[PDB]
Amino acid sequence: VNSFSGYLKLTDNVYIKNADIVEEAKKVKPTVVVNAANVYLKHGGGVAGALNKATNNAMQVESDDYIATNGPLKVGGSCVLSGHNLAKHCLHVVGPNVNKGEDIQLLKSAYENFNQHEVLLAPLLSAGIFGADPIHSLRVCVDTVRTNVYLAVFDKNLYDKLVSSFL
Ligand SMILES: O=C(O)C[C@H](NC(=O)c1ncnc2[nH]cnc12)c1ccccc1
């Protein structure tokens, strides 16, 4: 038993809610919150800007040190950093950004990072301003992630569309 509330059940391991991931994290304090990061860990907008703002820019400061030491991530890759005031850890996962012309096939590789963690609070990778088809991304999530994932969808109309079309 865990502490998430009001989530709709989709498969053996995936739950979904129309919610602000920042507020879900502040409430649950999950072991792992997933950030929809880019390879430079420049947290400007979307999930990343929202999470970083909620940490008072501490996420960005930590991320800049990470990049200075290690260089950029790969599209499809991830790193584990602090969750600051939101979670124990933040798993920064880079899905492909269709608005940058990146390869949508890399979405499955991106979701595979979730399997290294027993339970996660996460956004829908590559959706929103990342420009991929969100129905396709939810499908890839359910068909790739085997650990317990609690998906937070910000946009109400999107959430309703995703639930109503889920197979
Ligand atoms: O779920 C959605 O609608 C799409 C989702 N975007 C957000 O979650 C989001 N965006 C902006 N500001 C926010 N403040 C709280 N959540 C926020 C997203 C998924 C993947 C990559 C980029 C964005």
Curated annotation (Swiss-Prot):
Subcellular localization, as worded in the UniProt entry: Host endoplasmic reticulum membrane
What is stated about the way this protein's activity is regulated?
A: Inhibited in vitro by GRL-0617.
Task: Please give the annotated consequence of changing T31A.
Answer: In strain: Mu/B.1.621
What kind of membrane protein is this, topologically? Multi-pass membrane protein
Name the chemical reaction catalysed here. Answer: Thiol-dependent hydrolysis of ester, thioester, amide, peptide and isopeptide bonds formed by the C-terminal Gly of ubiquitin (a 76-residue protein attached to proteins as an intracellular targeting signal)
Domain of life, per the record?
Viruses
| The Macro domain, residue ranges | 1-167
Assembly and interaction partners: May form homohexamers. Interacts with N protein.
What biological function has been recorded for the protein in this entry? Answer: Responsible for the cleavages located at the N-terminus of the replicase polyprotein. Participates together with nsp4 in the assembly of virally-induced cytoplasmic double-membrane vesicles necessary for viral replication. Antagonizes innate immune induction of type I interferon by blocking the phosphorylation, dimerization and subsequent nuclear translocation of host IRF3. Also prevents host NF-kappa-B signaling. In addition, PL-PRO possesses a deubiquitinating/deISGylating activity and processes both 'Lys-48'- and 'Lys-63'-linked polyubiquitin chains from cellular substrates.
- This one is known as Papain-like protease nsp3
- What organism, scientifically named, is this protein from? Severe acute respiratory syndrome coronavirus 2 (2019-nCoV)
Q: Tell me the gene name.
A: rep
Coverage span on the entire protein:
1025 to 1191 of 7096
